[PDB]
THAUMATIN-1
Amino acid sequence: ATFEIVNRCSYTVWAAASKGDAALDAGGRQLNSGESWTINVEPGTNGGKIWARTDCYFDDSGSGICKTGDCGGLLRCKRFGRPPTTLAEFSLNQYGKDYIDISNIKGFNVPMNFSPTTRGCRGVRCAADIVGQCPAKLKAPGGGCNDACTVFQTSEYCCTTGKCGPTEYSRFFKRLCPDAFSYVLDKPTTVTCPGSSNYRVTFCPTA
Ligand SMILES: O=C(O)c1cc(-n2cc(CO)nn2)cc(C(=O)O)n1
Ligand SMILES: O=C(O)c1cc(-n2cc(CO)nn2)cc(C(=O)O)n1
Ligand SMILES: O=C(O)c1cc(-n2cc(CO)nn2)cc(C(=O)O)n1
Ligand SMILES: [Eu+3]
């Protein structure tokens, strides 16, 4: 499957793509404002994620640091990124269909649209100014808006036992972005697409 990753932000981002125990395609790349990077994701990829990283430095070997979304200091991510990270999430070719969503469960750093480029389903978007409106206690000094689990480490915010409800913090993310997951047990906003669809992830779709 092809994923065209487009940076419409006015700032550089370092795109990342991983399924947690391996890179997808090269795993990461710099995208200056306006640049597009198309990756190939293997059919059947389960639990894949794409995100933006901000304020990164990498040496000539591809090792360094990012202020949001750092994946073990690598340009080419093999693992998932450090919150806060707005997440484009997908599982492909699962009994004949693809499944996509956006999640704020690991916080929000950069606005995003995640849409099919082929027929048969809608896209999803979380493009509100979550960082600007972020509750004081969730603001990440390194940049972005943390989820409450990251900040407070409670069973209720982290849904540790599989039982939890919405919270004042989850409701903030849900108010700003109704079409993204705001906590682990949120009413799902997953979209079912035809198996083997192709996609575009756009950072700052309205900004
Ligand atoms: O065991 C680990 O340290 C570990 C494992 C995974 N895994 C993620 C997946 C797939 O969802 N499998 N291991 C991710 C990370 C990380 O992002 O730091 N770390
Ligand atoms: O760099 C890692 O391998 C790593 C870093 C973190 N950390 C993330 C943060 C910030 O929220 N602090 N450590 C968690 C994990 C894991 O759970 O596997 N793994
Ligand atoms: O503590 C962790 O979360 C962690 C630790 C290691 N470590 C591996 C080694 C061996 O040299 N030491 N920490 C790898 C990872 C990961 O790849 O996600 N994660
Ligand atoms: Eu780890």
Notes: Residues 79 surround europium (III) ion (ligand 4) (CB under 6 Å). Residues 107 and 147 are 4 Å apart (CA to CA).
